[PDB]
Structures are given as structure tokens and as C-alpha cells.
Design a protein around this ligand. Structure first.
Ligand code: ADP
Length: 364
């Protein structure tokens, strides 16, 4: 091979995924955190491990970069610590959130070429990459991560900004809600350490009920839905209706005091904002992505809820890839490996010729 490996870096609100184009999975995943004492800067797992003696910062808390100084440190960490490569020696494909401000796109571009001296780079919308990973160029993606969720209609490879909806309800909120209802049950999960334990309980024992009320009735009259969970100190606790009550908040945000529409309604509203001529393509190609869409039963629940909102004559299909937790990264690996994509990279030459603003033309 003549070309060096290209890098794929998925910038997540909670976890960053990094690896090499062509691979089937990211080589590294770490917390999008930077910490400094209350070694001068700590990034990733280490910052989390030593959070006791540090003040943590979340530079991309809700999907959008808010502090470029710390984001630069996360990227430095990604190259030198996680992937152990020199960025000046590899093209880099970066991901961005839907509705990312134009100025931010230019900033990312300038930093890659001027700070890291990348030989080439490109930036793609997360939702679009997930759609690519599913083998489609048209459809609507419901991306629910750690600090944010989005419904992104995509037609022929292009996201439709006017129809994109943002929901400030995701994995983080669900974890805290589970801590709250488990505490109401009689336990006590309130500390940061306990938040990590509940996050684990959430990822392992929660599920989306097909019918909330029926599930609540079953849990109230029997122990058939109860599951045991063992804490590190040996204590075994019981999780009952909390298993499905937690993710139910995605469909009924009021449980969290939020007036926002649930994910099914948000998906429907996005589709309705698109040209009537492509709505059927979206209904027939609703793809789920992100860690928060991993709950067992979520696909069937979405199918049921969307069917209730859409015309009776509409064909509804929910696609839930088993590997959807990393579909963004995988889509990037696929894209960066495409023969026709090689001409699309922004080269250092092109950057020197046109400057940061070239990103709008090259990465439309
Ligand atoms: N199996 C699972 N069930 C439910 N939630 C999960 C599961 N696996 C991961 N999560 C949650 O998904 C979120 C992270 O997903 P991700 O798409 O990586 O987000 P981001 O890109 O914003 O960091 C976290 O809140 C995590 O707890």
C-alpha cells in the first residue's frame, strides 16, 4: 500500500471513539474529559480515575465544542496517547454534531492543519455516517448519545438542516433518573461514585416496555420482571419496574419535568418538516444510532409509536443495527476507505490555497 492509514475520530459528548479507517471497530474509546489539579493535564480514563484530585472539564458536553483549548488537548491525547501516531503523518476524518455552527467547522479545520499539521482532513456529520454504516444514503436517523439526542432526516447523503431536531435528553439524564427512582425505592444512589454504578445497572438491566401501563401492572402484582444486581461489596439489590421506567422517559420526558416531545414524536415532527415527496422514504428508513438506543425493546416500541402517529397507509420500518453503538465511527471507517472519497479529502495544499473556509465547500 502506498497510502498511510487514515484516522477516524468520533468526537462524542461523553465518549470519544478513535481508530484507523478500514478497521471494523474503533481502536480506542475514552471519556471526553480533561482535568487539572484542584503531569499538568489529565485526559480520558486517567482524568476520570483521578477525578478526586482534579477539577473536570467537559469541552463537548452537548455535542458542540465549547472550549477549544481543552478540545485541542483531547485531540492531542487521541493521537499521541490512544492511537500512538503522529497526526502530521496521517489524514484525519473527524465527526461533528448535526447543526454544528459554521464557525466551529472552520475552527476544527484550522486546528488540524495549523496545530497538528495534518496532511489531509475532512469532517462529516455523525448521523450521516451512521446512515452510511447501515448501507443507505436516504433515511432519518435518531441519534441518542450521552449528552444530546437528534433526529436527522438525510436525503441522498445530505442532511436536511431545516428538519433536524435537537432533544436535550439523553443517556446522562436517564442515568440520573434511574439514581432518583432507585433511591425512591429505598436504596440510596446519589454520589458521583454511585452514578457510575447506576450507569452500569442502566446499561445492563434496563429495557423499553412495549406498553408502559401493562408492564407497570405486571411489576406491581408479581416479581417476574425483577432482576438482581450485585454491588462490588457483595450486596445484592433488586431492580423492578425501574428497569423499564428509566428509559420510558425517552418517550415521556415529563417524567423528568421536561415539556419536550418524546423521541417518537420528535422523529415524526422531523419527517413532517421535510418535503412531502421524501417522507415515505424516511418512514421506511428510520435508523437508530447511539448508546442510548441500545435498550432492548426500543425498536419495537418505536415501530408501534410511529405507526400511531403516521397515516394508516404508511409503511413504517425501524432499523436497529446490532452495532449501532459505534455506527458513527464505523460509518467514518467505511467512508474514509472509499475509492471515490479520496478526492474529497481537504489536502494541506488546498488549505494553504484557500484557508479554513474551504471546509464549507469541501465538506458540504
Ligand atoms: N446497552 C446500553 N443500554 C443503554 N444505554 C447505554 C448502553 N450502552 C451505552 N449506553 C449509554 O449510551 C451513552 C453513550 O452513548 P454514545 O452514543 O457513545 O454517546 P456520545 O457520543 O454522546 O458520547 C451513555 O449515556 C451510556 O450510558
Amino acid at each position: 500500500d502506498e497510502e498511510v492509514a487514515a484516522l477516524v475520530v468520533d468526537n462524542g459528548s461523553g465518549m470519544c471513539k478513535a481508530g484507523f479507517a478500514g478497521d471494523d471497530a474503533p481502536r480506542a474509546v475514552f471519556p471526553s474529559i480533561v482535568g487539572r489539579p484542584r503531569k499538568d493535564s489529565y485526559v480520558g480514563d486517567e482524568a476520570q480515575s483521578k477525578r478526586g484530585i482534579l477539577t473536570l472539564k467537559y469541552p463537548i458536553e452537548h455535542g458542540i465544542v465549547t472550549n477549544w483549548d481543552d478540545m485541542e488537548k483531547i485531540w492531542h491525547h487521541t493521537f499521541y496517547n490512544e492511537l500512538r501516531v503522529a497526526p502530521e503523518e496521517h489524514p484525519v476524518l473527524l465527526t461533528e454534531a448535526p447543526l454544528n455552527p459554521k464557525a466551529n467547522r472552520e475552527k476544527m479545520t484550522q486546528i488540524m492543519f495549523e496545530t497538528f499539521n495534518t496532511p489531509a482532513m475532512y469532517v462529516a456529520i455523525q448521523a450521516v455516517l451512521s446512515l452510511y454504516a447501515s448501507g443507505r444514503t436516504t433515511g432519518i436517523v435518531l441519534d441518542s448519545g450521552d449528552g444530546v439526542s437528534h433526529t436527522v432526516p438525510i436525503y441522498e447523503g445530505y442532511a436536511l438542516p431545516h428538519a433536524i431536531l435537537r432533544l436535550d435528553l439523553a443517556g446522562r439524564d436517564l442515568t440520573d433518573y434511574l439514581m432518583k427512582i432507585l433511591t425512591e425505592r429505598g436504596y440510596s444512589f446519589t454520589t458521583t461514585e454511585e452514578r457510575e454504578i447506576v450507569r452500569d445497572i442502566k446499561e445492563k438491566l434496563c429495557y423499553v416496555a412495549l406498553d408502559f401501563e401493562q408492564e407497570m401492572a405486571t411489576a406491581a402484582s408479581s416479581s417476574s420482571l425483577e432482576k438482581s444486581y450485585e454491588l462490588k461489596d457483595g450486596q445484592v439489590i433488586t431492580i423492578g419496574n425501574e428497569r423499564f421506567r428509566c428509559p420510558e422517559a425517552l418517550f415521556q420526558p415529563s417524567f423528568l419535568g421536561m415539556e419536550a416531545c418524546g423521541i417518537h414524536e420528535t422523529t415524526y415532527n422531523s419527517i413532517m418538516k421535510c418535503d412531502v415527496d421524501i417522507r415515505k422514504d424516511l418512514y421506511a428508513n428510520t435508523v437508530l444510532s447511539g448508546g442510548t438506543t441500545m435498550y432492548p425493546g426500543i425498536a419495537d416500541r418505536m415501530q408501534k409509536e410511529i405507526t400511531a402517529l403516521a397515516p394508516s397507509t404508511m409503511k413504517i420500518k425501524i432499523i436497529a443495527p446490532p452495532e449501532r453503538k459505534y455506527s458513527v465511527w464505523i460509518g467514518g471507517s467505511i467512508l474514509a476507505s472509499l475509492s471515490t472519497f479520496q478526492q474529497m479529502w481537504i489536502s494541506k495544499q488546498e488549505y494553504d490555497e484557500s484557508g479554513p473556509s474551504i471546509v464549507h465547500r469541501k465538506c458540504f
